[PDB]
Amino acid sequence: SMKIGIIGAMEEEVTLLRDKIENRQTITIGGSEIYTGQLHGVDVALLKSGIGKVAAAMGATLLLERCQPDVIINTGSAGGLASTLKVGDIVVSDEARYHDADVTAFGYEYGQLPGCPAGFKADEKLVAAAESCIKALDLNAVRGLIVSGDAFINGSVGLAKIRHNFPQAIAVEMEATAIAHVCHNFKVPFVVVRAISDVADQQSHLSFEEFLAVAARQSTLMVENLVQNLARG
Amino acid sequence: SMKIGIIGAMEEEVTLLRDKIENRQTITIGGSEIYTGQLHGVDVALLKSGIGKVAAAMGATLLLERCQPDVIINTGSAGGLASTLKVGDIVVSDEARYHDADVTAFGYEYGQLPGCPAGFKADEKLVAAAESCIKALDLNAVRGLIVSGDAFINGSVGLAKIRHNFPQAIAVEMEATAIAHVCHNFKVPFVVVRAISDVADQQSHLSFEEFLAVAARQSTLMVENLVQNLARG
Ligand SMILES: Nc1ncnc2[nH]cnc12
Numbered sequence: 319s320m321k322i323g324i325i326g327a328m329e330e331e332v333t334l335l336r337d338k339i340e341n342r343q344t345i346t347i348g349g350s351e352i353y354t355g356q357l358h359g360v361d362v363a364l365l366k367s368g369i370g371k372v373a374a375a376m377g378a379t380l381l382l383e384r385c386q387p388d389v390i391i392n393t394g395s396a397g398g399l400a401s402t403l404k405v406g407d408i409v410v411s412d413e414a415r416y417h418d419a420d421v422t423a424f425g426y427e428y429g430q431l432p433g434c435p436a437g438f439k440a441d442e443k444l445v446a447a448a449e450s451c452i453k454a455l456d457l458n459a460v461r462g463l464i465v466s467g468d469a470f471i472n473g474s475v476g477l478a479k480i481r482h483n484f485p486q487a488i489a490v491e492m493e494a495t496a497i498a499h500v501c502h503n504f505k506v507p508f509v510v511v512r513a514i515s516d517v518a519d520q521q522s523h524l525s526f527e528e529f530l531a532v533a534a535r536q537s538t539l540m541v542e543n544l545v546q547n548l549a550r551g
Numbered sequence: 552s553m554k555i556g557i558i559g560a561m562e563e564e565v566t567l568l569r570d571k572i573e574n575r576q577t578i579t580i581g582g583s584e585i586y587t588g589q590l591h592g593v594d595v596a597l598l599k600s601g602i603g604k605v606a607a608a609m610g611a612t613l614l615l616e617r618c619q620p621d622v623i624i625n626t627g628s629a630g631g632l633a634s635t636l637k638v639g640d641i642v643v644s645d646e647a648r649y650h651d652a653d654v655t656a657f658g659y660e661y662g663q664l665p666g667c668p669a670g671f672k673a674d675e676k677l678v679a680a681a682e683s684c685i686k687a688l689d690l691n692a693v694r695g696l697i698v699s700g701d702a703f704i705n706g707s708v709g710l711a712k713i714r715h716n717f718p719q720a721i722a723v724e725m726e727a728t729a730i731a732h733v734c735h736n737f738k739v740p741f742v743v744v745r746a747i748s749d750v751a752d753q754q755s756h757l758s759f760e761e762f763l764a765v766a767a768r769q770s771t772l773m774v775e776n777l778v779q780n781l782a783r784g
Contacts, residue, residue: 379613
């Protein structure tokens with residue numbers, strides 16, 4: 319049996335998935351929460367990480383360490399940067415880069431940190447399974463580079479800087495690249511499957527308030543089907 | 552009765568300290584090596600931190616989670632922000648904050664992340680202990696605020712920002728706050744100590760490779776005295 323680990327940051331991003339877990343058990347390790355059980359017959363371990371890179375890092379580390387899932391899906395909300403994107407649309411990582419790391423003085427690519435690739439690559443089979451679920455579920459989706467940082471992007475210079483440095487980035491958020499970095503170090507396959515809550519302009523906080531519940535529902539639909547698809551056929 | 556976790560940025564320090572551990576055992580998890588044993592009769596756990604907040608968090612989490620130390624001592628080198636500091640001063644954190652965290656869109660203080668304090672407070676008796684230890688080595692201990700972030704800040708165009716957003720900040724590097732965050736999450740008292748390698752343009756006498764030779768020796772002795780004085784009571 320495959321065990322699938324699922325990571326979302328916020329209670330609202332995790333609460334629908336957690337309600338669907340059977341035989342559900344809760345583990346606190348300081349003080350992040352991991353819910354274990356079966357989701358549609360598939361062993362899962364669901365982490366609520368909290369917000370940002372170190373919260374994500376510490377939780378992903380405790381998840382891999384304690385529960386030893388075979389695979390990691392990171393779910394939740396994100397700020398759309400691709401032009402097509404509308405609120406509720408799915409984004410799937412083909413890769414993940416930090417938008418706020420810079421050791422370019424020592425020869426690395428912008429966004430790259432030592433001992434890491436410049437971008438972390440999402441596992442191909444997990445990408446293809448997510449795309450299978452997108453098409454089966456008839457969702458609007460875009461596959462691409464997700465960028466992460468300890469900043470909620472809200473227009474102005476913050477946003478401009480990310481579009482200048484990462485013109486191919488499709489979505490921006492605060493945990494995925496930290497999760498991808500942990501999984502590089504543990505050699506565990508990852509994918510991010512998130513939904514758009516805002517478009518990272520100077521209304522993004524208002525949009526996020528308005529549409530976070532839609533982002534959560536849409537990313538939960540994908541994930542709960544993706545765990546079935548991965549764990550069987 | 553005590554177990555003391557030691558996390559060092561400077562490789563030569565971690566080396567010298569490892570070589571002093573009795574009944575040493577080594578573990579590898581997630582590409583981190585943790586050494587455990589007795590230093591001068593005290594149960595320790597030892598780890599060299601990686602570069603940036605995720606790598607450091609990961610390392611910290613695995614130390615704290617596997618070895619359950621009573622306290623964290625976190626060592627390294629930093630850049631000086633206060634024009635009043637001298638290359639060779641040792642900063643002892645009273646507080647750590649992120650210089651590159653921005654959730655101000657939702658009203659948080661700059662550098663603050665949701666669910667966290669705006670700064671992570673160093674433990675007062677470990678600060679005091681670290682200070683005595685520094686002064687007894689004939690070294691100059693300066694207490695205050697350390698900021699960290701995943702951009703290397705030497706020069707720039709940049710460094711204000713840092714002083715603009717954090718007057719009060721006296722030192723900057725890339726891991727401290729991340730280690731401070733994890734310790735706060737596990738409720739483990741910490742102290743962050745940092746040898747000052749350069750001060751903002753008091754441009755500069757000894758190369759970093761030469762600074763590090765001396766710093767890593769002074770810091771090694773500092774750590775073995777601090778471990779003893781904390782054990783003693
Ligand atoms: N605009 C935004 N910036 C960063 N993380 C986000 N998650 C959702 N919307 C976001």
